[PDB]
Amino acid sequence: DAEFRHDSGYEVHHQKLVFFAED
Numbered sequence: 001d002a003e004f005r006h007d008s009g010y011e012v013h014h015q016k017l018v019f020f021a022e023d
Protein backbone atom coordinates (compact mmCIF):
# COMPACT_ATOMS: atom_id res chain seq x y z
CA ASP A 1 0.00 0.00 0.00
CA ALA A 2 0.86 3.75 0.16
CA GLU A 3 -0.04 4.43 3.89
CA PHE A 4 0.77 1.73 6.52
CA ARG A 5 4.67 1.89 6.41
CA HIS A 6 6.18 3.16 3.04
CA ASP A 7 5.88 4.74 -0.43
CA SER A 8 2.90 6.13 -2.46
CA GLY A 9 2.50 4.65 -5.99
CA TYR A 10 0.29 1.59 -5.16
CA GLU A 11 -2.65 0.23 -3.10
CA VAL A 12 -0.66 -3.12 -3.44
CA HIS A 13 3.15 -3.88 -4.02
CA HIS A 14 3.83 -3.76 -0.24
CA GLN A 15 7.60 -4.34 -0.47
CA LYS A 16 8.43 -2.85 3.04
CA LEU A 17 6.36 -5.63 4.83
CA VAL A 18 5.04 -7.97 2.00
CA PHE A 19 2.25 -9.73 4.02
CA PHE A 20 -0.87 -7.56 3.48
CA ALA A 21 -2.04 -6.17 0.08
CA GLU A 22 -5.80 -6.63 0.56
CA ASP A 23 -7.10 -4.64 -2.51
Ligand SMILES: [Cu+2]
Pocket residue numbers: 001002003004005006007012013014015016
Ligand atom coordinates in the same frame (compact mmCIF):
# COMPACT_ATOMS: atom_id res chain seq x y z
CU1 LIG B 1 2.60 -0.75 0.79
